[PDB]
Amino acid sequence: HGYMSFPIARQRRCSMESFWYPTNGDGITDPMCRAAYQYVYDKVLDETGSTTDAISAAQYEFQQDNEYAALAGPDYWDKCHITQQVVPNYLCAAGAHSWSNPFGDKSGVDISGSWRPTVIPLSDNHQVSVPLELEFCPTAVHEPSYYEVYITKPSFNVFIDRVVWGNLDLIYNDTVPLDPRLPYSICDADLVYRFTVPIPIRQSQAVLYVRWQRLDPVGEGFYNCVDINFDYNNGPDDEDIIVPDVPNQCASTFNYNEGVPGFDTEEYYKYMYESLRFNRY
Numbered sequence: 613h614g615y616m617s618f619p620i621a622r623q624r625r626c627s628m629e630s631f632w633y634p635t636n637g638d639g640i641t642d643p644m645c646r647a648a649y650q651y652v653y654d655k656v657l658d659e660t661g662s663t664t665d666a667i668s669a670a671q672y673e674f675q676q677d678n679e680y681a682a683l684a685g686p687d688y689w690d691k692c693h694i695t696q697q698v699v700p701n702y703l704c705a706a707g708a709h710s711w712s713n714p715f716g717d718k719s720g721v722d723i724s725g726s727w728r729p730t731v732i733p734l735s736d737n738h739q740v741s742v743p744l745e746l747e748f749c750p751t752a753v754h755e756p757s758y759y760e761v762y763i764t765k766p767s768f769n770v771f772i773d774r775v776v777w778g779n780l781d782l783i784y785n786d787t788v789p790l791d792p793r794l795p796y797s798i799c800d801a802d803l804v805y806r807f808t809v810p811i812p813i814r815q816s817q818a819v820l821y822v823r824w825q826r827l828d829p830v831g832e833g834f835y836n837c838v839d840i841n842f843d844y845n846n847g848p849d850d851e852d853i854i855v856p857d858v859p860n861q862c863a864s865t866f867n868y869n870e871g872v873p874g875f876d877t878e879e880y881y882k883y884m885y886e887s888l889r890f891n892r893y
């Protein structure tokens with residue numbers, strides 16, 4: 613059992629919110645965490661007609677942040693078994709989408725939208741990959757086990773696409789060492805699974821799908837979605853920097869040509885809404 617602590621798992625970020633009270637989820641500040649709570653709450657309220665069940669199902673989704681799990685059985689290594697029978701859908705819920713069944717309903721966490729990412733700064737804009745030391749926060753030491761990390765394909769759109777096996781690429785597969793936590797770790801466990809993964813860079817928000825799979829007959833696996841984005845450096849690209857190899861003039865602090873219409877002036881914004889008139893109905 614456990615969850616991704618660095619970058620933080622989507623469901624772990626939600627479980628740090630005040631979801632216990634008020635019971636309708638209005639104490640949850642993050643709009644996507646609040647929508648995930650309210651999705652399961654409204655789903656269960658509409659099927660059973662019981663508010664107590666709606667509250668319990670929605671709370672369970674965030675209380676079980678360390679149990680986003682699925683049982684694969686002895687053939688946990690069989691890719692088609694995982695993709696078609698164990699976690700065929702609702703990947704960020706580890707396939708759990710039924711409140712009265714084992715693992716409940718965590719499908720609110722799998723909805724699309726403006727999930728808040730961990731923003732990773734780039735050291736250099738030509739970096740193809742960023743070696744990032746991932747931290748998995750185990751609430752129990754389960755060995756033998758291994759970790760797989762997937763990343764969404766380059767054109768994945770977090771606002772509208774579901775994370776599915778068809779839009780995920782495997783970037784890491786290894787046994788990871790159980791190590792001491794580094795300073796300022798948000799993991800509440802005493803030891804952690806820390807591992808250096810080369811994360812492919814993206815210009816838009818991506819999702820890492822981390823799978824912690826036990827190698828045993830029961831085959832319990834833990835699956836978490838991790839929202840990430842990349843902060844590019846501003847200015848000209850390093851390869852386009854021509855340096856000079858060889859009267860007193862100064863620029864002022866005056867707002868040059870203030871009042872003249874142009875880019876980012878109110879005229880430009882008003883013009884844009886007229887240019888987008890065919891986009892409104």
Ligand SMILES: *[C@@H]1O[C@H](CO)[C@@H](O[C@@H]2O[C@H](CO)[C@@H](O[C@@H]3O[C@H](CO)[C@@H](O)[C@H](O)[C@@H]3O)[C@H](O)[C@H]2NC(C)=O)[C@H](O)[C@H]1NC(C)=O
Nearest residue numbers: 688689690691756758759760782784785786787826827828
């Ligand atoms: C990540 O790496 C692990 C470790 O190499 C991969 O697990 C291994 O996967 C292979 C192929 O699915 C398994 O082989 C199969 O074993 C069964 C039983 O012995 C045999 O009947 C098959 O013919 C085949 O040889 C292998 O057992 C398994 N290893 C362990 C320790 O579980 C895993 O597939 C990799 N993940 C991805 C996404 O590729």
Ligand SMILES: [Zn+2]
Nearest residue numbers: 613614752754
């Ligand atoms: Zn466990």
